[PDB]
Amino acid sequence: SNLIEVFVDGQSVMVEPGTTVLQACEKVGMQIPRFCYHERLSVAGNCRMCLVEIEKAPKVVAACAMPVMKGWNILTNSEKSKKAREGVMEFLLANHPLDCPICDQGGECDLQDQSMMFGSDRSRFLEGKRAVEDKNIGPLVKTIMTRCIQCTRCIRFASEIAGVDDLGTTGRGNDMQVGTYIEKMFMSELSGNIIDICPVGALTSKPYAFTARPWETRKTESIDVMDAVGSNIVVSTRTGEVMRILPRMHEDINEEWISDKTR
Amino acid sequence: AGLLKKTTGLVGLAVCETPHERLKILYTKILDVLGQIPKNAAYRKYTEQITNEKLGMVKAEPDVKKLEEQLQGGQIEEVILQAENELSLARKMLRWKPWEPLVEEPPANQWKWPI
Amino acid sequence: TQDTQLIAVDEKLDITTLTGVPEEHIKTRKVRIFVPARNNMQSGVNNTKKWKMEFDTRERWENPLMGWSSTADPLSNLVLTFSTKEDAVAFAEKNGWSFDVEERKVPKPKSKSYGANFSWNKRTRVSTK
Amino acid sequence: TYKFVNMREPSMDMKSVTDRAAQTLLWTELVRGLGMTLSYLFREPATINYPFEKGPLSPRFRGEHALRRYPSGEERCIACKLCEAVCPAQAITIEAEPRADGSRRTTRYDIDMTKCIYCGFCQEACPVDAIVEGPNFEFSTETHEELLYNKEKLLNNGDKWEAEIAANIQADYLYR
Amino acid sequence: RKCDPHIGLLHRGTEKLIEYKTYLQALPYFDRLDYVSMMCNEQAYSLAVEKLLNIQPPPR
Amino acid sequence: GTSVKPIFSRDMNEAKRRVRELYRAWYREVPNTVHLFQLDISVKQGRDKVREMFMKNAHVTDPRVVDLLVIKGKMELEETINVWKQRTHIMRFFHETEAPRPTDFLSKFYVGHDP
Amino acid sequence: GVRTSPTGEKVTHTGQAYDDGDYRRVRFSDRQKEVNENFAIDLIAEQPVSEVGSRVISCDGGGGALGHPRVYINLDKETKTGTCGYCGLQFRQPHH
Amino acid sequence: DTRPTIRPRNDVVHKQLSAFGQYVAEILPKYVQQVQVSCFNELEIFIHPDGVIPVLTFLRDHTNAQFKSLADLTAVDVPTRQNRFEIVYNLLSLRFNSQIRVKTYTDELTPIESSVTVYKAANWYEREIWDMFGVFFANHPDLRRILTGYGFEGHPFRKDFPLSGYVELRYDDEVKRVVAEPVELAQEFRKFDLNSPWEAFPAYRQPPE
Amino acid sequence: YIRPGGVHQDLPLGLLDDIYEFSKNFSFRIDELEEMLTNNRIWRNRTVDIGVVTAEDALNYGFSGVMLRGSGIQWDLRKTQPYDVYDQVEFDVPIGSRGDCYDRYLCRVEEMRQSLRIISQCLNKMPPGEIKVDDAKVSPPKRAEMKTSMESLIHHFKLYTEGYQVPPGATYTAIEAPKGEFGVYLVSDGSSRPYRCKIKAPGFAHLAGLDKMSKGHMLADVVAIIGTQDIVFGEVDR
Amino acid sequence: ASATRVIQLLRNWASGRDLQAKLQLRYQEISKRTQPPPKLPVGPSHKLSNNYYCTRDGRREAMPPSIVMSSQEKKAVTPAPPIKRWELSKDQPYL
Ligand code: SF4
Ligand code: SF4
Ligand code: SF4
Ligand code: SF4
Ligand code: FES
Numbered sequence A: 001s002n003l004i005e006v007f008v009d010g011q012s013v014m015v016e017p018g019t020t021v022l023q024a025c026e027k028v029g030m031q032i033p034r035f036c037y038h039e040r041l042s043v044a045g046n047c048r049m050c051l052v053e054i055e056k057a058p059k060v061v062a063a064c065a066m067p068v069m070k071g072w073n074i075l076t077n078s079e080k081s082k083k084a085r086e087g088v089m090e091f092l093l094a095n096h097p098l099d100c101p102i103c104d105q106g107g108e109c110d111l112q113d114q115s116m117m118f119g120s121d122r123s124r125f126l127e128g129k130r131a132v133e134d135k136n137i138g139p140l141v142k143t144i145m146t147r148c149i150q151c152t153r154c155i156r157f158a159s160e161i162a163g164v165d166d167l168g169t170t171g172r173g174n175d176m177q178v179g180t181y182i183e184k185m186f187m188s189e190l191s192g193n194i195i196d197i198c199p200v201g202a203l204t205s206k207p208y209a210f211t212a213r214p215w216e217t218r219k220t221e222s223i224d225v226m227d228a229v230g231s232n233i234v235v236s237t238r239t240g241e242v243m244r245i246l247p248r249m250h251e252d253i254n255e256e257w258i259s260d261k262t263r
Numbered sequence B: 001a002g003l004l005k006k007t008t009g010l011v012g013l014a015v016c017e018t019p020h021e022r023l024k025i026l027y028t029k030i031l032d033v034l035g036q037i038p039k040n041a042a043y044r045k046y047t048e049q050i051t052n053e054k055l056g057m058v059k060a061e062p063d064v065k066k067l068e069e070q071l072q073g074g075q076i077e078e079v080i081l082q083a084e085n086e087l088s089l090a091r092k093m094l095r096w097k098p099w100e101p102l103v104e105e106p107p108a109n110q111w112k113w114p115i
Numbered sequence C: 001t002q003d004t005q006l007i008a009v010d011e012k013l014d015i016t017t018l019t020g021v022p023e024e025h026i027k028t029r030k031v032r033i034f035v036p037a038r039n040n041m042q043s044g045v046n047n048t049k050k051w052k053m054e055f056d057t058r059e060r061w062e063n064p065l066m067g068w069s070s071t072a073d074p075l076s077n078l079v080l081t082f083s084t085k086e087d088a089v090a091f092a093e094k095n096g097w098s099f100d101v102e103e104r105k106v107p108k109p110k111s112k113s114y115g116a117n118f119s120w121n122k123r124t125r126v127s128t129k
Numbered sequence D: 001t002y003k004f005v006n007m008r009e010p011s012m013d014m015k016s017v018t019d020r021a022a023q024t025l026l027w028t029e030l031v032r033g034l035g036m037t038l039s040y041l042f043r044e045p046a047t048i049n050y051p052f053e054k055g056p057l058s059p060r061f062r063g064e065h066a067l068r069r070y071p072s073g074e075e076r077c078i079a080c081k082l083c084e085a086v087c088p089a090q091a092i093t094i095e096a097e098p099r100a101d102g103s104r105r106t107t108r109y110d111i112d113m114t115k116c117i118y119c120g121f122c123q124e125a126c127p128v129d130a131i132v133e134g135p136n137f138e139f140s141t142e143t144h145e146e147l148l149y150n151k152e153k154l155l156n157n158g159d160k161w162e163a164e165i166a167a168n169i170q171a172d173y174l175y176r
Numbered sequence E: 001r002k003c004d005p006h007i008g009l010l011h012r013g014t015e016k017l018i019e020y021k022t023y024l025q026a027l028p029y030f031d032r033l034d035y036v037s038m039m040c041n042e043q044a045y046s047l048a049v050e051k052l053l054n055i056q057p058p059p060r
Numbered sequence F: 001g002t003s004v005k006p007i008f009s010r011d012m013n014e015a016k017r018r019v020r021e022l023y024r025a026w027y028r029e030v031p032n033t034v035h036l037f038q039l040d041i042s043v044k045q046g047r048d049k050v051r052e053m054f055m056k057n058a059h060v061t062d063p064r065v066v067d068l069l070v071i072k073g074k075m076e077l078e079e080t081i082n083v084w085k086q087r088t089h090i091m092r093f094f095h096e097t098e099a100p101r102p103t104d105f106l107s108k109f110y111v112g113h114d115p
Numbered sequence G: 001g002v003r004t005s006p007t008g009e010k011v012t013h014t015g016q017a018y019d020d021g022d023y024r025r026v027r028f029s030d031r032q033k034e035v036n037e038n039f040a041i042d043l044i045a046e047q048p049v050s051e052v053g054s055r056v057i058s059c060d061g062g063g064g065a066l067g068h069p070r071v072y073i074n075l076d077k078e079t080k081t082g083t084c085g086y087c088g089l090q091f092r093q094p095h096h
Numbered sequence H: 001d002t003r004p005t006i007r008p009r010n011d012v013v014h015k016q017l018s019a020f021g022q023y024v025a026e027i028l029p030k031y032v033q034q035v036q037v038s039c040f041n042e043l044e045i046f047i048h049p050d051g052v053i054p055v056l057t058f059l060r061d062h063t064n065a066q067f068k069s070l071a072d073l074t075a076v077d078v079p080t081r082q083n084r085f086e087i088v089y090n091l092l093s094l095r096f097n098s099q100i101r102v103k104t105y106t107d108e109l110t111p112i113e114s115s116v117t118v119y120k121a122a123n124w125y126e127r128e129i130w131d132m133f134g135v136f137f138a139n140h141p142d143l144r145r146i147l148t149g150y151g152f153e154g155h156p157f158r159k160d161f162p163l164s165g166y167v168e169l170r171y172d173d174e175v176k177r178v179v180a181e182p183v184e185l186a187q188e189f190r191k192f193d194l195n196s197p198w199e200a201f202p203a204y205r206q207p208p209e
Numbered sequence I: 001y002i003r004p005g006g007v008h009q010d011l012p013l014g015l016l017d018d019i020y021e022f023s024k025n026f027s028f029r030i031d032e033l034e035e036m037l038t039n040n041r042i043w044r045n046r047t048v049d050i051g052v053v054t055a056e057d058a059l060n061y062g063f064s065g066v067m068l069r070g071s072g073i074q075w076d077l078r079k080t081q082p083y084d085v086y087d088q089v090e091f092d093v094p095i096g097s098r099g100d101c102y103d104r105y106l107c108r109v110e111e112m113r114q115s116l117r118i119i120s121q122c123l124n125k126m127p128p129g130e131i132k133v134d135d136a137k138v139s140p141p142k143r144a145e146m147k148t149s150m151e152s153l154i155h156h157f158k159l160y161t162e163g164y165q166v167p168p169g170a171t172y173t174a175i176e177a178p179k180g181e182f183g184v185y186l187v188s189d190g191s192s193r194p195y196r197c198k199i200k201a202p203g204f205a206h207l208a209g210l211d212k213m214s215k216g217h218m219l220a221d222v223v224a225i226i227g228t229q230d231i232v233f234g235e236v237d238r
Numbered sequence J: 001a002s003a004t005r006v007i008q009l010l011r012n013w014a015s016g017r018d019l020q021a022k023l024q025l026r027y028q029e030i031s032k033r034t035q036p037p038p039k040l041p042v043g044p045s046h047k048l049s050n051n052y053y054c055t056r057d058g059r060r061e062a063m064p065p066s067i068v069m070s071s072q073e074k075k076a077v078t079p080a081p082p083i084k085r086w087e088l089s090k091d092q093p094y095l
């Protein structure tokens, strides 16, 4: 019908008008690296990792907020696209603290995984790293704000999904401190889910903190019983006991979020 | 040609004292059995190509010492052994007859690694 | 087309008797199948594409000396990989294991936008950027 | 290039055959074996007087493991959890907890000496070079349980061989 | 007349566990494969693995 | 799909034909096996046991599965008479070292939480 | 330091303590229970609190190559002396 | 190499093998379903199950092939394929210093007539492919077990078979004989899921399915 | 030591010197053996004309290395298909011309001397440079770089837990291990772990041919043929 | 080394060679076990100038096998040129 035709790195694929560059990519199976966009959480466009050069382009387009039109070949594996990925990834990693052996995201960190696939193999930094003072927004979630990459995914989640306005990014320039400025307390029934949305170890679950690692924890699929909603969740078991409970993908029941009590 | 070399350097394979004509009569034999297999066959065309051509100088050039580099296949005493192997193949694929299309196409995508 | 003295067998294929999985490990194993669910704090999806052959977890008791996870389930730590599910189900028939499946949770297509974050009447205007 | 190893052309002159007949009749070649072996009889042996003297080793030697600690005294291991992940025998078993201070280390570092391979991957695993193999190799025993190590046993060994391994990694960390 | 070399008195998983150990973890297996030629086995493994990775070691 | 290769047998008749003499051979071998292997079990126990493993798989329908398992069952009787196996390799079939596993529902419930 | 349990049973830094019966303790008699007398928690607590007047301090831990991966811990929380995760040394800063 | 990190490639061998790949293809359009030359100058000849004798006899005695060195025969148990087993021959040519790979799909029941007549090296190299995997080889001198224990049950290399197996031995003082029991481990295999959720190299990606 | 991407570590300083001292004195020790055994009648009569094979059967039996070179077969992996830096060095392959037990023995001792040639050449032509590839995605970063650079730490973390992901495919690589042709055939599924690895054990083919060896020979010669077949059961039994 | 001369003649004469030139064991010739610290080189791509990983992608530059013929006047060729008969040894052809 009205589905506009467009090419991706060659092969053409029709798509609904208004669809952004990403949403056309996975139609063929392309997952462009992203840090600030969640498929069910607004559109940020600040990470710039989704940046992919398009055909004939003099400038690499921000794939998240760019509506595609007729005949726009997505140059996914193109050199300058990977060049943009290389530059932007090392920029995110610039002020990041060397915490991987002590950060719980080790083994399941998006910043960790993508740097293996879409990343360099050595450093060009010769200066001192930025250090952000830690915060405290609950005994259920830890805050290590130096590991933050300011993807703003937490503040959007609170604003719409959690329905509470208590998170934001105070400061200017490199002093992009994301938090509550004043001392506040992030009590919402969906508060525990900001751990999952964060791509880095910026927020982690205190109860699970320093108890297990992603590779060793066996996963099992079960249901939530703490509420009549009956949310589909995956249970982490290792050495014969349970450590952490993660929400599953079920658009009808829980989407990908669960209540604090269930987590 | 020249003096009959004592050993071939490969135990089990001996030295044939009349090698040039044995290679001749072998090469005709494979040409002979290749008569049975019809013309459109590719195997026939391939070996009808290297038989007569390799039968050429062995008929013309009689010096087996020069015949070494004419065939670039090592010593003549095992070239005839290889010629026998080609004769064995001619007998063998006169049964095989692989000129028909595939017996079976591969069931679905049994190929296409990775899974 | 395969004429080597053809036979036809309509019996559903099974190999359980010659494979030799023991009698208490063939009928007492409720083998379930799903597409692996993506870890929810990993945006990458290069795990929700295959099928698996997981089993049901059995008793796991701590070793008396040093607190191991000593387990007598030989079949516990085996997961297979299947491209589609009809090949995955075929494996269940030939080995005759207990059966249940789970359909792929395909992503419903979320109509994203950026101008919605700055609206004039709709509340989709974001409160922070 | 290549060369033959058994092409022998025994000259059939009256000279050489006499030598060949001399070889067979008078056991000349066998006498060489006697004179050959007699030569080392009158030579010194190279038998190290163990345990009054040991074998020569190197600073990179891998032996009994021992968890080390900082000059302050705090343990190096930080629940890094890399060591068992890269260990190809799964001898390492480590579980961490919260700690009272917040420097949440592990309660368990049981490595089974009857499972480990002395791979060398252990020191390469943890960035804080917590677990290393000490140069000791005489940690033999009589009951299989003692070979099963535990967090206390390694840390005790770290406090024992601390004088040795500290100098070993001192003279070898540049290579690593 | 005939001799049957009944092998198996040292048969181990080897290849079976290699399916479950990573490439780095699988490397010590070859050292214990032809246990008299230690370094030569790893030569085969490293040459094979780097061939798949299309990566050649430095001349040193 | 239905059409398939008869690895040795067209029909279960010749499959059941195959099991017969192998059953005859396995019943003939029992007195000598126990004799030279120096066991304590009785000849009838071997017979009623050789009975046993013939039955737990006496329910297949594909003549490939039965006759492939025939060569499988073929593959121990010679492995016995040429004293290749040890004493521990045929008392293994006489599983005796274990406690008798529980049969009633109550007994499993008492032992543990495992069907 | 090290404490003593009711059964003697010198407790470890983790806090393991066999109970009254706890039949597993039979392996302990006629032998000795290995205890590391040096406890990690109380040999870092008494260590002097470093006084460095800066907002950001590297924490390589001595012998940068031979120490631990260098961190850039922040020193602004005047309530709590900022300490390296790996090192455990407590770095405090004098009066901003 | 300008880029010493990556391994240099040999194109000259690449089409030369590709030329030989088509070569054998035209002789046997009945058997050769698929020919593939990989990036690292390795050629693969995909053949039909009943081609073990013909193509191997072709490769062994041809004037332009002379592949008489049987390197190894291996199976690749792929559950997701209706033909789980994949018998893989490797051939080596002394005269042309090249290597040949041929693969045949096969089910559990479907047999493969033995290649002992072509290469007598395969005599011992089938007694374990029957052991480890369970693919039976027809008209073969002997199929005896030479890797698995005497009277061991199953085919361990099959991926439905556990790494720990099912039987564990122990000497029993009751009967003065080492006997087998169901396996119970001191510690279970702590499996690790190391497959990163983010996509690897996009070259070998499967098409949208 | 031999890891994908090079070697794990660099040699300790002066190690080339000590091995050079060993290399100088070792040729004497080889002369020691040849003096002891080569001309001794008892050794020859227990070894000469024993376990002989023809070239064709030896090649068809899947044999490799000395098992072929002893029977006069003109083949060697280092020369025909030079892997690594074996092309930039010359060595004389000791091809025998009898195929019996004795020919292989002389073939081995000459291979000892020809091995000593390789030590001498690589010693005088040892180049400088790094010990592993300059790619952290397959080679762990240097310990010094580990503790100062983030990308080193990430790559070190993911390499020691997940490991490098190898592109999918199949490869049977071949090297001339002093036993024979020790080849490893592995299939990569595209993950960070191997999918299936089959190893070409030279002893396997050789032990397979042990039947044809023992035909027409003494029982006290089955030990002799077993000895020269360079069989170690860790290799033949996988 | 310790060994007096009269013993040395006995060893030398019995073995038919001089042995004090080179001995099985070791002596002062070995390098001391406290060698100075090394200064290992840096990688070829260690430069902080243009060094983008977009250039070196050994793992990523790999390509699935090339399709040449699929089920779904001619010349005769060989997979490689036939081997060349190598000449005898120049140093010592006949041992
Ligand atoms: S956020 Fe990721 S990269 Fe950063 S320290 Fe934590 S695990 Fe490492
Ligand atoms: S704290 Fe986490 S979720 Fe919030 S902006 Fe930083 S990285 Fe994103
Ligand atoms: S010993 Fe090393 S690898 Fe193991 S947890 Fe501690 S720091 Fe990590
Ligand atoms: S002791 Fe050896 S096998 Fe065990 S974890 Fe350490 S390196 Fe690996
Ligand atoms: S996805 Fe476009 S910037 Fe994060």
Ligand SMILES: [K+]
Pocket (backbone or CB within 6 Å): A105, A194, A195, A196, A197, A198, A199, A200, A201, A202, A203, A204, C041
């Ligand atoms: K997070």
Ligand SMILES: [Zn+2]
Pocket (backbone or CB within 6 Å): G059, G060, G061, G068, G071, G084, G085, G086, G087, G088
């Ligand atoms: Zn520190």
